[PDB]
Design a protein around this ligand. Structure first.
Ligand SMILES: Nc1ncnc2c1ncn2[C@@H]1O[C@H](COP(=O)(O)OP(=O)(O)O)[C@@H](O)[C@H]1O
Ligand SMILES: [Mg+2]
Length: 339
């Protein structure tokens, strides 16, 4: 695999990237980068002296080897320059614009100026639905209903769930109680309940930063959802570090949950890009908005716990991670019911 993959990759890029066929396999550099289990990813480049030699302008590409089709969404996202530009396709993968920065770190999410930048970008991203014409066949049923329903059904079919938690049926029961609550709750006249085209996996590793220019990647879970669910996911992710490089390959720091003041600064910045100048906007917009986010956070914990259980059964400690997201459900629920 590791020794044989590069040669395959080199041949395709030579013929699928403009001007690269001027080179040979010896001028091209393949480097596998870290990814999820759903794809293999490689930084492919040309040797820099050879790029200057052969006057090659595009020095790097991303080589990607493989409800809503991820691909269909990705190509719409690329069209509007939200995602890295699609360069080309081959059977089994795609070649994308290479982004020069780095994913945001978990500690970046503490920086207020970065939070502001994320809120600006997310505020704009969320207007796409009303400002462009998205493919109309896309299901507009909020992904919270779909993900919760689909993934809970699948977890109910498993044997040995007590090997995840003694109290698993409590959370299977919690889920449809949440869906019924969320059916009523999101009918409140508040923009947090707007249904827009959502990323659905908003987190530091999906936000590329090039010299203070923030880009979004990874549209695998993308679809229409309550706008506050995209934001709740981001807020949650301030307490989860996936960079940790030994078992269980994630670290939870709940003390790091984005502070109240940072949350108001994020929501305010967000609304300054999401809302039109002429928006019909009440006094408690921020209060209700911050409340809807915490409400959605509750469901996300279930959604991602069930997701992680399915991955555990079909394959990072997925089960410990589910367990942790369930403890978060419990904690979040106490919090909500408090106020
Ligand atoms: N177009 C790109 N340019 C440079 N780096 C990328 C690009 N796309 C992804 N990466 C890197 O690979 C990682 C995973 O990419 P992504 O597709 O979002 O995740 P996954 O492969 O887990 O679905 C990112 O954190 C980023 O560092
Ligand atoms: Mg990702």
């Amino acid at each position: 695999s590791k020794l044989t993959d590069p040669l395959y990759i080199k041949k395709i890029c030579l013929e699928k990237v403009h001007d690269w066929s001027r080179c040979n396999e010896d001028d091209v550099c393949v480097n596998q980068i870290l990814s999820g289990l759903t794809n293999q990813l490689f930084e492919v480049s040309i040797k820099e002296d050879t790029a200057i030699e052969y006057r090659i302008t595009r020095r790097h590409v991303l080589f990607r080897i493989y409800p809503l089709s991820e691909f269909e969404v990705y190509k719409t996202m690329s069209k509007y320059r939200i995602a890295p530009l699609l360069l080309n396709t081959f059977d089994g993968g795609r070649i994308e614009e290479w982004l020069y920065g780095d994913p945001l770190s978990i500690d970046d999410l503490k920086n207020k100026s970065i939070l502001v930048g994320i809120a600006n970008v997310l505020g704009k991203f969320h207007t796409l639905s009303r400002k462009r014409h998205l493919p109309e066949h896309w299901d507009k049923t909020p992904c919270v209903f779909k993900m919760m329903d689909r993934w809970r059904l699948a977890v109910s079919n498993y044997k040995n769930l007590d090997k995840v938690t003694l109290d698993i049926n409590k959370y299977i029961q919690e889920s449809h109680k949440f869906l019924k609550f969320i059916k009523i709750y999101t009918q409140i006249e508040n923009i947090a309940n707007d249904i827009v085209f959502c990323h659905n996996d908003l987190q530091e590793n999906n936000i590329m930063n090039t010299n203070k220019c923030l880009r979004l990647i990874d549209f695998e879970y993308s679809g229409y959802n309550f706008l506050s669910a995209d934001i709740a996911n981001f807020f949650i992710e301030t307490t989860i570090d996936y960079s940790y490089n030994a078992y269980p390959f994630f670290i939870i720091n709940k003390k790091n949950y984005i502070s109240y003041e940072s949350r108001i600064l994020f929501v305010t910045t967000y609304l300054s890009k999401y809302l039109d100048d002429s928006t019909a906007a009440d006094q408690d917009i921020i209060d209700q908005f911050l409340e809807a986010i915490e409400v959605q956070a509750l469901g996300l914990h279930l959604i991602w716990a069930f997701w992680s259980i399915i991955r555990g059964y079909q394959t990072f400690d997925f089960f410990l991670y589910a367990k942790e997201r369930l403890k978060m459900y419990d904690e979040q629920k106490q919090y909500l019911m408090s106020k």
